[PDB]
């Protein structure tokens, strides 16, 4: 086509999706990770995660308002990844990298798994 | 913070949101523009448009599944803008620029209004 493109559009959309999340506006699911709960938008989760894409395209699970993650999943690891989904920013630290990588593997977030593998290999 | 950022994340999220829209997955509103209907996600509309942000933060309108636009709104103009919302790409042409600009003004999409004003001024 002969379209023009607004460079910052995708980033501005994501910034507004994060603002809606922070204000709990039109959030439609709560992700339970052991004792912790995280409110989010199903569409954003599906757009970032192979696991959530599978869950919310399921004819029964698409209608659930609560999703309970595997008890082995670390809440801080999940929190860091949920923030990454809504911002493109990953708070990767020596103290959380193992939890972040295991959570990204479970959530099927290949690019996060990739940078975790690379950061781990550099320290060995 | 000490975060790392994945450059393509925002663009990949938007591409997946557009794929969900095309497959009518978790769409939660229909926008009626005279004889035409457009299915979309409220969160994406709010993230792109001052008008939709106002409508869906309203305590009554947030719960509506159908929104009827002003009868003066051109369906093709709306279609071009809805595509822009989900892709960052604006199909701006001599034959549609007036309709696109009027629709962007109504929807409160300042950057689109700006490029329409500039393209119009260049042709006078």
């Amino acid at each position: 086509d002969s379209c023009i493109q607004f460079t910052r559009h995708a980033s501005d959309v994501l910034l507004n999706l994060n603002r809606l999340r922070s204000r709990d506006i039109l959030t439609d699911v709560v992700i339970v990770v052991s004792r912790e709960q995280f409110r989010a938008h199903k569409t954003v989760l599906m757009a970032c995660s192979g696991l959530f894409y599978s869950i919310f395209t399921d004819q029964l699970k698409c209608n659930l308002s609560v999703i309970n993650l595997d008890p082995e999943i670390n809440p801080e690891g999940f929190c860091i990844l949920l923030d990454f989904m809504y911002t493109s920013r990953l708070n990767l630290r020596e103290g959380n990298i193992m939890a972040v990588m295991a959570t990204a593997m479970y959530l099927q977030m290949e690019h996060v798994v990739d940078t975790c593998r690379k950061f781990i290999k550099a320290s060995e | 913070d000490s975060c790392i950022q994945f450059t393509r994340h925002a663009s990949d999220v938007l591409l997946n949101l557009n794929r969900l829209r095309s497959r009518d997955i978790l769409t939660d509103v229909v926008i009626v523009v005279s004889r035409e209907q457009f299915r979309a996600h409220k969160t994406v509309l709010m993230a792109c448009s001052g008008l939709f942000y106002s409508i869906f933060t309203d305590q009554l309108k947030c719960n509506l599944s159908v929104i009827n636009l002003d009868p003066e709104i051109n369906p093709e103009g709306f279609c071009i803008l809805l595509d822009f919302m989900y892709t960052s790409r604006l199909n701006l042409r001599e034959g549609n620029i007036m309709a696109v600009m009027a629709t962007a003004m109504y929807l409160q999409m300042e950057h689109v209004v700006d490029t329409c004003r500039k393209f119009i001024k260049a042709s006078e």
Partner: peptide, 4 residues
């Protein structure tokens, strides 16, 4: 705005 750019030519993509």
């Amino acid at each position: 705005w750019v030519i993509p």
